[PDB]
Amino acid sequence: AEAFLNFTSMHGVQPILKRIRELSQQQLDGAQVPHLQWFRDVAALESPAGLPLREFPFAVYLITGNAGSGKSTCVQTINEVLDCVVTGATRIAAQNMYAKLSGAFLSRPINTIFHEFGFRGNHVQAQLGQYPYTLTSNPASLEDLQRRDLTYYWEVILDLTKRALAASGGEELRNEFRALAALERTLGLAEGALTRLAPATHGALPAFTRSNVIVIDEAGLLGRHLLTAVVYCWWMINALYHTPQYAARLRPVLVCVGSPTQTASLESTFEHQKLRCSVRQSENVLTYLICNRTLREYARLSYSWAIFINNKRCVEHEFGNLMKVLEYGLPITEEHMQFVDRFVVPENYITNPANLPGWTRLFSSHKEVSAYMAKLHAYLKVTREGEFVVFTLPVLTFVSVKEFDEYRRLTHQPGLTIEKWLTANASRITNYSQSQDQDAGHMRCEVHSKQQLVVARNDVTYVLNSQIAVTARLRKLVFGFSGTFRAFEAVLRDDSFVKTQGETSVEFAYRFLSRLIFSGLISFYNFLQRPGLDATQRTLAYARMGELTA
C-alpha cells in the first residue's frame, strides 16, 4: 500500500525539526557579529597574508544516509514547516529537488549554491591555491581553519568582495532596507514591521537576505573550502543591506544532506610550463565536519546528526548483506567472494557491442569509452538492425590570435603548435565532461584572416532515434507533433503543460496549441484509407462528421 511506508519516516522527523528550530533562533552577542569593516579591509588587500584572525559564527545540521533511503522526505518536511533556502551542489540535483518539492505541495525555483552566493562565469577558471599557508596553532582553532579556507579560495573570494562592494554605487550605502528602518524609527512602529516587507517590494534581492537556514543537497560533491566561503558570503550579503536578521544577531544554519560514503570531490591543477592537467582527491564538506576534531567540538555534531538507515530500493538478501558489508567496512569473508563470482564475464564479451544489447558500460577512462563508442557506431553502421541510421555533424572552435600571442608572451613557450595546445587543453575548452567520450574524426585546422582567427573543425558521430540527454541550458522551441491521438488528447485535457512553462508565456502558448489544433486536421482520410477497413462505415462517418459540423 502507501500508508505504512511513511509511518516510520513521519514520526521520526519531528526531533529534527525541533532541533533545527532551536538552532536557527539562537542569538549571538554584540561583539561577535562580523562588521562591514571586516569585508572593507578584506577588499582593500593584495595578497592573503594580511588577513587577521577573525571568526565567522555558524551552525550546521547533518542529515546523512544512503541513496534512496528517504532524506528527500525530510527535506520536504523542512521546506513545508520551516522558512529555509533549498539549494543544490549541481544543476541535476537542484532540478530533482525542485521536482520533488513542487510535486509535494509548492516550491520556488531552486538554484545551485554557487549561483546563490554569487559565483560568476569568470570565477570558473581561477587558479585555486597558489599562496602557501601553514597552520600555526596545535590543535587548530576555528579562526585558523577559516583563514586557511579563505587563503585557498583567495581569487574567487577577493573578486566576490570587490564586486559586491563596488556594485553599491560608491559610498552611497544600499537603501533597500535602511529607508524602511528609518521610517520605522520616525513613525514609532514595531521592529521589523516594515523592513521585512522589503523582499516583497524589491525582486532583485538575493535569497541570503531572506532566511538564515540554508539547505544544501548532495553536500558530498563539494570542496571543503566551500564550507567557509558560503558562510563568509552570507555575512557579507547580510552586512551590506543591514538585513533584519543581521540586526537581530542571527547565525547561518547549514543543513547538509548527502551520503559520505559513495560520493567524493576532486581538485584539478594545470601546469602551463608542461601543458599538463593533474587531478587528485580532496575532502568534501561531510568528511570535513565528521572527521575534524575542531569542527566536531565547535558545531556539537553529536547533537546535530541524523542518520537514515534502511533502503527502499534493495530487495535482495545476499545483495543487501554485501552492500551493508561494503558500506560499513565490515570484514570480508569467503562467502562474499563466492557470491560475487556469479557476475564475472570475460572482458571481450563486455567490450563487444553485439553482446548485452542496450546495457550501460562503466569504464575507468575516457579513452576506453571513446573506443567502445567508436566500435558500437561501426557495428551499427554495418550490422544494422534498422530504425537507427548513423550520421555525422560538424563542430568547431575559434581561437583568437592576439590572445594567443599574449598567452605565449606571458608563458615563455617560444613555439606552440595549435594542434598540440588544443590536444593538451581538450579537457578545459568544453563546458561538460562528456566531450571526451564523443566519437570524433580527423581534426582539421585553418587560419581565417580579416577576423584574425583560427578555426579548428571536426566531426561528431551520432545515432538516429536514440535516447540522449542535454547537458546545458540550451533554450529550445517546440513546433508541433504529438505521436498518437491518445497522447494528443492527454496533453489537451491536462493544463499541466501550460503550468510547466513560466507564468509569462501562457497567452501565446495557448495560441500555439490553438494553431496546432487547427493544423492537426486533414489526413484523417489516409487513416480511413487503411487497407480493408469498410465501405458503409465510411459513409456513416461522413454523415456523423457532417452532422457535428452543422
Partner 1 sequence: DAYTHDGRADGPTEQDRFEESRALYQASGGLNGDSFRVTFCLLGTEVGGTHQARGRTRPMFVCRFERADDVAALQDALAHGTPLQPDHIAATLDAEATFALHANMILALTVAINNASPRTGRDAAAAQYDQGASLRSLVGRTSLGQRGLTTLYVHHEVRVLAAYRRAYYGSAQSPFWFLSKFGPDEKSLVLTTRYYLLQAQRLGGAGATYDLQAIKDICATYAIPHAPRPDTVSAASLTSFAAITRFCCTSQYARGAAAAGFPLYVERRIAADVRETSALEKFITHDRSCLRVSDREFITYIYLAHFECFSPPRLATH
Partner 2 sequence: RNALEHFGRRETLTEVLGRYNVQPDAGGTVEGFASELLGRIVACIETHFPEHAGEYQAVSVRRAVSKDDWVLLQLVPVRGTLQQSLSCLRFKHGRASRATARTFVALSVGANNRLCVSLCQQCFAAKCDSNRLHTLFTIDAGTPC
Partner 3 sequence: LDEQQLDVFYCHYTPGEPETTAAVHTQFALLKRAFLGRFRILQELFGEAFEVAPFSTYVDNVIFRGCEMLTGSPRGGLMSVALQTDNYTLMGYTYARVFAFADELRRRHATANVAELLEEAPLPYVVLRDQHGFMSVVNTNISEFVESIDSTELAMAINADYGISSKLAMTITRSQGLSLDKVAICFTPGNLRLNSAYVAMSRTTSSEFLRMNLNPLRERHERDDVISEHILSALRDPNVVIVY
Partner DNA sequence: TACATAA
Segment 328-367, which members bind partner 2 (CB under 8 A)? 334-335, 338, 341-346, 348-349
Can you tell me whether residue 59 is helix, strand or coil?
strand
65 annotated as belonging to a binding site for a ligand: yes
211 annotated as belonging to a binding site for a ligand: no
C-alpha cell at 291: 572527521
Q: Considering only residues 51-110, where is the footprint of partner 1 by CB under 8 A?
A: 76-77, 80-83, 104-106, 108
- 399 — phi, psi (to 5°)? -120, 135
For position 545 contacting partner 1 by CB under 8 A, the verdict is no
Beta strands in 149-220 (DSSP E): 213-217
For position 386 contacting partner 3 by CB under 8 A, the verdict is no
For position 28 contacting partner 3 by CB under 8 A, the verdict is no
For position 533 contacting DNA by CB under 7 A, the verdict is no
Q: Minimum CB separation from DNA for residue 242, in Å?
A: 26
67 annotated as belonging to a binding site for a ligand: yes
For position 118 contacting partner 1 by CB under 8 A, the verdict is no
For position 132 contacting partner 3 by CB under 8 A, the verdict is no
In whole angstroms, what is the distance from residue 253 CA to residue 258 CA? 16
In whole angstroms, what is the distance from residue 55 CA to residue 53 CA? 7
Q: Which helix (H) or strand (E) holds 458?
A: strand 453-463
Which residue in 278, 239, 241, 307 sits closest to 62, CA to CA? 307
C-alpha cell at 141: 582553532
480 annotated as belonging to a binding site for a ligand: no
Q: Which helix (H) or strand (E) holds 327?
A: helix 317-328
Q: How many residues bind DNA (CB under 7 A)?
A: 30
For position 155 contacting partner 3 by CB under 8 A, the verdict is yes
Quick one: what does residue 114 bind among DNA, partner 3, partner 2, none, with the CB cut-off 5 to 8 Å set by partner type?
DNA
Question: Which of 186, 302, 338, 431 touches DNA by CB under 7 A?
Answer: 431
Q: Given the complex with partner 1, which of 406 and 495 has the nearer CB atom?
A: 495
Q: Minimum CB separation from partner 3 for residue 342, in Å?
A: 8
For position 513 contacting partner 1 by CB under 8 A, the verdict is no
What are the CA-CA distances from residue 534 to residues 123, 214, 524 (Å)?
69, 66, 15
Quick one: what does residue 280 bind among partner 3, DNA, partner 1, none, with the CB cut-off 5 to 8 Å set by partner type?
DNA
Stretch that binds partner 1, among 36-44, 195-203, 409-417, 479-487 (CB under 8 A): 195-203
- Confirm if 261 and 327 have CB atoms less than 8 A apart: yes
Torsion (CA) 242, 245, 250, 252 in degrees, nearest 10: -90
For position 328 contacting partner 1 by CB under 8 A, the verdict is yes
Residues 6+ apart with CB under 8 A from 12: none
For position 261 contacting partner 3 by CB under 8 A, the verdict is yes
- Confirm if 149 and 223 have CB atoms less than 8 A apart: no
70 annotated as belonging to a binding site for a ligand: yes
Question: Which of 9, 41, 82, 91 touches DNA by CB under 7 A?
Answer: 91
For position 170 contacting partner 1 by CB under 8 A, the verdict is no
Quick one: what does residue 549 bind among DNA, partner 1, partner 3, none, with the CB cut-off 5 to 8 Å set by partner type?
partner 3
Q: Which helix (H) or strand (E) holds 446?
A: strand 444-448
Which residue in 351, 345, 321, 316 sits closest to 333, CA to CA? 321
Question: Which of 91, 324, 336, 377 touches partner 1 by CB under 8 A?
Answer: 324
Q: Considering only residues 73-92, where is the footprint of partner 3 by CB under 8 A?
A: 74, 90-92
520 annotated as belonging to a binding site for a ligand: no
For position 300 contacting partner 1 by CB under 8 A, the verdict is no
Q: Minimum CB separation from partner 2 for residue 350, in Å?
A: 11
C-alpha cell at 395: 563542430
Which residue in 70, 114, 71, 69 sits closest to 91, CA to CA? 114
Q: Given the complex with DNA, which of 136 and 433 has the nearer CB atom?
A: 433
Q: Minimum CB separation from partner 3 for residue 294, in Å?
A: 15
Question: Which of 420, 434, 446, 447 touches partner 3 by CB under 8 A?
Answer: 434
- Sequential DSSP letters for 97-155: HHHHHHHHS-------HHHHTT--SGGGG-----S-----SSSPPHHHHHHHHHHHTHH
For position 330 contacting partner 1 by CB under 8 A, the verdict is yes
Q: Minimum CB separation from partner 1 for residue 112, in Å?
A: 21
For position 529 contacting partner 1 by CB under 8 A, the verdict is no
Q: Minimum CB separation from partner 2 for residue 241, in Å?
A: 58
Q: Given the complex with partner 3, which of 190 and 522 has the nearer CB atom?
A: 522
Mark residue 183 as left, alpha or beta (left: phi above 0; alpha: psi -120 to 50; beta: remaining).
alpha
Task: Give the CA count within 13 Å in the CB-facing half-sphere of 13.
Answer: 20
Beta strands in 182-322 (DSSP E): 213-217, 253-258, 265-271, 276-282, 305-308
Q: Considering only residues 98-137, where is the footprint of DNA by CB under 7 A?
A: 111-112, 114-115, 119-121, 124
Residues 6+ apart with CB under 8 A from 107: 79, 86, 98, 101
DSSP letter, residue 342: G
Residues making contact with partner 2 (CB under 8 A) = 317, 334-335, 338, 341-346, 348-349
Bind-site residues for ATP? 65-72
Site of interaction with partner 1 (CB under 8 A): 3-4, 6-8, 10-12, 14, 17, 21, 25, 76-77, 80-83, 104-106, 108, 175, 179-180, 183, 186-187, 189, 192-194, 196-203, 309-310, 324, 328, 330-331, 493-496, 499, 503
Q: Which residues are annotated as a binding site?
A: 65-72
